[PDB]
């Protein structure tokens, strides 16, 4: 005889007695066809009854489901595409799976998670895998603080052996309704435990988090998690795409993201605020959001082959804003930075504050005619802030018809470029025969009224102000200037850049910008003061010529040679 | 009771009537044992009959297969290791799977795809997964335009939630017979749709494409696809390993390749022709093929930790040819460039055209005695073209017994290195007491007849031509020269390189190369003019000594100091 | 009639006679419920029995298991959580799986592997997949030389089509008992085979190797393997975390590691000893172990986004030791280098030997008050060895209260920094009016007694020794010096660093360190001689002032400007 039973209730009611008998369950719920399987009668098992993988019959005899491979939620009575809250059945199935160090599968379908009780995934025991397709976890009615957390139950082993063997979460679209106070995923622990939680090597892959307060938030013990093909979008919090708060314990080692997409925040963004925290992003995209870094110290973010872009957006938000702290480093290596047109880009899209560093390697700096960064900076450049920028292998868009701009003040070719010395030192001021000509430093006379400017008012003959510095091939350059013509009898002058070899031979490839006749502060140089460093150049010379009878103020004479 | 039927045809013939009854199918095809399962009789179902997951019995009653997990092709009557065309059963199973947002599994075996109808995978609905092992999809008799295309049916959501949740293709060896007009995989769409297709985050993994016309071709909407462990080899088209044509719409954001192998093209290659297109290759290998970039503008390719090599090949093909356009950037960061011997490498293996940039970071430049790049360039260097090269952390093979060469013209240490000034300026020509010694610039007199040369024909005493430039530690250097001795009474002279500190102290370790006595254009410097920059060096001085009575032409005096 | 059999023994003993009949096996072992399935009776097949998928009944009739998808070890009688050796059943199941190009699954549980015969996985035919959870393979009683090896049976095809389609090993924790002579995983072949083995694209993922002699060792044909989420810890051999021995054939192309953790060796380490070998590590961590590179030539290791740290360890072991050979390159790009306090870090944590190169890109160099590298080097710097270091985008910890140090001798700003010229050249020695002041080079008089030193003993008025060099913004600097005051009448002097523009204007912010009055060799500069390069600086000047009546030796005047 090979007994078969049509439902879990009927299986449980029968007086099973023969040890080792195999009994078939057709379905967990009568008439559905899911959750069935083979069960072994055991009269001496100590296993806990759970109406799923261990059934205690009414006479006390245990029936042990024969499972090869993962546990499935339907083994505990979960149903696909049901209007009943599925979180209890998933939580019960997960508790069993974790207890036997086996992953839990959720069959592909839609599920509703209601109530307020989170699921804590223990990556040292079991992950939760949507199997396989577009598994939809509707948390729009969930009211708890977090839907999922991921945190090991151990301080060392066997987490050091087991976390890496299977993902913690895979294959799930998890979404809310942007209710204040409900977050999606907590990576680590809410509060500091008495002992550490060993979370290294834990993976979240092929999941989307959407429409939470914070979609993904790092907690304590957030270290060596890896994310592959994770999407985070449309969160409520200003920090809601991905938030790493300050003050985390036992956190920060190589948080890694491969081919993840952080996007369409509609006001939500990424913020890294924890000190001594190292994040690596490989082939990720950051779209219509800002990446803020305000850690007190020792944040290191590396973006290898990533894109930063504003697709379909009119927002002037920054792409990367390193705004506080010291010894914070942000690397952009390869990939792309793309700036679609908007009504006017009135602030720098990259910003690096004092004592911090933004490194650009092997990436092209974009240019667009809508660039208006001078509204923030006082002058036309791509990057703001008093930190440091470095370039290695950076390409400028030298053939862009709208222009090119320098990248940053810290890359200035010329000394006293902004008259910040408080005088005209480092510049040679050649009035020629014009003994009456006026050339004066003026405090608080530049574009913002808080910086110096050089006023040039030649009489009878023009005045030439110049500076020479060492350069060599290979390289490319762009210069911008702020100029304010007060009056002029025609073209007011020109700014020129030329190159010489070490013997004083003038090389081809000199460029020049005419000042014109329009009064008021304006940017000079966009599509003129740019080019490639000639092969054999050893010196670069800038010259500012102002004609007789013109009266011009100059500020922020910013050349960058990327080399 | 518990009814069972031995075939799909027998299941359909029975007059099922009891709503909710579960019925077992032993096998789809009688006697095979595959494709069976449990079916639920459903008297009110609106489901589409398909002889797979929805069966309409002879009396009109629907039976619904109870599926937990992915759909499998054998549920629709597909059979393994059959000579019958399996593409119709796979296409029918895929249409159903996609309609329910569930992936499709193909059981591991060999399959033949015939006919001319492609399968379009919609990554926002379902992927196709060979499960699990070496699944072989023989398309040698397929005559359609493409075997697989991958393109979303949606312009935004739910593609933005679903594409990342599962791969689009996994686990398949897909091959043709190199017939003209049959491509393997189309990434995106053939023609521009009235709305965009949201393809970001779609993955192809663990697949091989072989013996098609173009194995992998990008179409419109090709953006943020990721490829892992994908092999492409032995295509028919000259661009057949991976082709990105010009003019694609809505394409180019972070196309990403992890641990992919592009190889053994037997005349097929990679070509990137689309503008504003960004590709990232991590740990890939490019073997016995060329990577062409001819985008009109704004291509950015980053190769992190990749290998470029010619294993087992006698071909002189280039490894990387950035051949057209402007503002195109190609980065080689880490990894390796390996040049096995061939009968003579008569063109540069890397080429970067005017207005483009090739960045080398942390990689060793190889050298081999079969290098003969001067046949193309006119002079002995590793990289061709009028673009720019940068180096950061590049190692030269300074102990290579065959020699070492400079990398590129744009890294020239000395000014007027190729006599491109049209004169001998930047060089100090010291005739000593030799008042009748001849030293002259000759137009169109170098190796190619298109460049300048310097002729030195001293009388009574030798002539020394020198130049000094700034250098610093750390660094490594290699110089090559082209020399043509017309006549000489013995060794014609010597080229030397030495270093000084800023105070004029000569530092030990200078190097020198004899010119010898052989007539005709020859390369000087291979094993001689190379070394490390001494710690404390601040100047480098080159000197070319030509003896009395010799008559020698010099061209292309190319030194590179890698930092 | 759907016949059913309760065990493999009963299936074999029954007098089957009807050709083509499908019969059901409930379980391989009576009463277990695992390993059952459908079998097709064949009166014509004479296939060789294997008691798993091809079963020969006692009457000679063949019963052919109908399998869809992977082979499972329980189909051959393997049992979970058994005290019997499971290696024979896994090896028999694997041999069959490989023969049909199908992967082998091992159901999640614990297994004991005993005996001494390895399993050689052929990645061109079949992988072994623990499915799905924390699969535990206890090899504590295994006595063979290796547990698993991975090496293809083919020289070209179909390995070029198949290796990438599925992993070779996945999902397994494999552990020993640290018995001498028993290794865990051999990547490739033990000895040089008759033809090459085509191993490219083979993956090991989601596995842990623990407590072997060497946990992971490369053999011949080790090329283009990829490892994802692999852990290696607690090996017996000094090279036991990961060993690449010298002398391998057909090996070294792009061995790739993604998100792997190499850790807690308790005396075991990573060692790369093979020449012409290229390894790429992305988001890996190296914890409480050393990474040794002693390849004779042409090793290239790239670490992208990795961490090197000593968490919880008092050991002074190095992090990276490139100790031999030539033309070896090690890249650290992004990521972090973290140095938790210990009783005194008495050797350099990074070391690069002559003719080799260590490149640092976009990473912060740490500092700690426990740094005592001068005990090894003779002077206070972070990196040892006579090789070369480069920096690009490197951050120094300028706000670290304990100090900052220079990175390496090869980055010396000043010439004759260590008196290695054998004289005082490159330094300006201004005795002022002090005609009797003594300033002299002394051989074998520095900290180690094997290097030069400069002794300054001024009479009546102080002596100032200075040097000037070119610098530019942006940059950061740190200088250390070794000083030995023999006698002094008060503060012995000061070392100062200042900046000028190209016109000789002194820029604000110079720094200085007093020498004090303590006798004996000491480090000067830690928290004093450091800072940012002023924007507009073009020269840096160091000055060493020694007061009248003092008698002081100076050595190792090491400034580094990271530009």
Numbering used by the authors:
A (entry chain C), B (entry chain B), C (entry chain A): 15 to 577
Give excerpts from the publication.
Here, we describe a phage tailspike protein, named K2-2, that specifically depolymerizes the K2 capsular polysaccharide (CPS) of K. pneumoniae into tetrasaccharide repeating units. During the initial stage of infection, the tailspike proteins (TSPs) of bacteriophage recognize specific polysaccharides on the surface of the host cell and attach to them for adsorption. TSPs, also known as polysaccharide depolymerases, have the function of binding and digesting CPS. TSPs typically consist of three domains: an N-terminal particle-binding domain that connects to the tail structure or baseplate of the phage, a receptor-binding domain that extends from the homotrimeric structure and is responsible for host recognition and catalytic activity, and a C-terminal domain that plays a vital role in trimer formation, receptor binding, and intra-molecular chaperone functions.
